[PDB]
């Protein structure tokens, strides 16, 4: 089943995830279908750190896909609208 | 053996010029004409002339400015052995702009200045500066 998950393209001790749709059986940082956000867990208070193309995501979710524990978490944190 | 007429033009010119010769003749053809035009229009020669019906005959009047001739260099660029075709964005500009390149497009035989404006491409016949 196709899933949305955190591919991790960080850097030793400074992780930075590419959130991505893909064939669940593929390598973490491997073949995906499309990128649908990113999540910088260092981001910091400054500005950006969790851009998330909600439109596509919840279209794949409807399309059939499913979501990581740690991705859905970013969504009921991003709030959704405001 | 007369397998490239356009080269023979380019050269009947080139030579006749270097031989400070006022006139120049040759058998004609629509293609010769369309070029003689551009050569006159862009002003590398005084004026042309085709005298005959059965066996037409281009005639070109060579310009000379100071002691020199006006045509500093006339060179084939496409040819039977090896043909050339640049698009529009890839058309050549001779002498950085000065002088010009004859090019046949689907909308007639123009210069690069022209074709660029026309927005299209063709077979770059020759260069002339």
């Amino acid at each position: 089943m196709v899933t949305i998950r955190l591919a991790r393209h960080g850097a030793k001790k400074r992780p930075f995830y590419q959130v991505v749709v893909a064939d669940s059986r593929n390598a973490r940082n491997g073949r995906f279908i499309e990128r649908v956000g990113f999540f910088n867990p260092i981001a910091s208070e400054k500005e950006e750190g969790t851009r998330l193309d909600l439109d596509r995501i919840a279209h794949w979710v409807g399309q059939g896909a499913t979501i990581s524990d740690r991705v859905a978490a970013l969504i009921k944190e991003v709030n959704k609208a405001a | 053996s007369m397998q490239d007429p356009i080269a023979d033009m380019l050269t009947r010119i080139r030579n006749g010029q270097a031989a400070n010769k006022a006139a120049v003749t040759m058998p004609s053809s629509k293609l010769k004409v369309a070029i003689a035009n551009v050569l006159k229009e862009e002003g590398f020669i005084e004026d042309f002339k085709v005298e005959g019906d059965t066996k037409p005959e281009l005639e070109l009047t060579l310009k000379y400015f100071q002691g020199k001739a006006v045509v500093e260099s006339i060179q084939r660029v496409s040819r039977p052995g090896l043909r050339i075709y640049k698009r529009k964005d890839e058309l050549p500009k001779v002498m950085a702009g000065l002088g010009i390149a004859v090019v046949s497009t689907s909308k007639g035989v123009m210069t690069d200045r022209a074709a660029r404006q026309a927005g299209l491409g063709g077979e770059i016949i020759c260069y002339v500066a």
Binding site: - | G81, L82, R83, I84
Partner: protein
Amino acid sequence: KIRTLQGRVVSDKMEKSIVVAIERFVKHPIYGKFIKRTTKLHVHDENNECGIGDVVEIRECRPLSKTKSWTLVRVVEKAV
């Protein structure tokens, strides 16, 4: 249609095993000169009719025989 080629026959002499030539012209990717790159194709024609030297129109179908993935669509000229 969805695309289609032409090209002269070259061989009719086999029970619907028609073969068609397809000459092109292409820039030599290194020396500019345009040269002739031919393509032969094993095309199906039922009730054998296309003849050696006939120009003919051709379309691409599913695999008929090992070797055949094209059928004819029309004919064009004969008696070369």
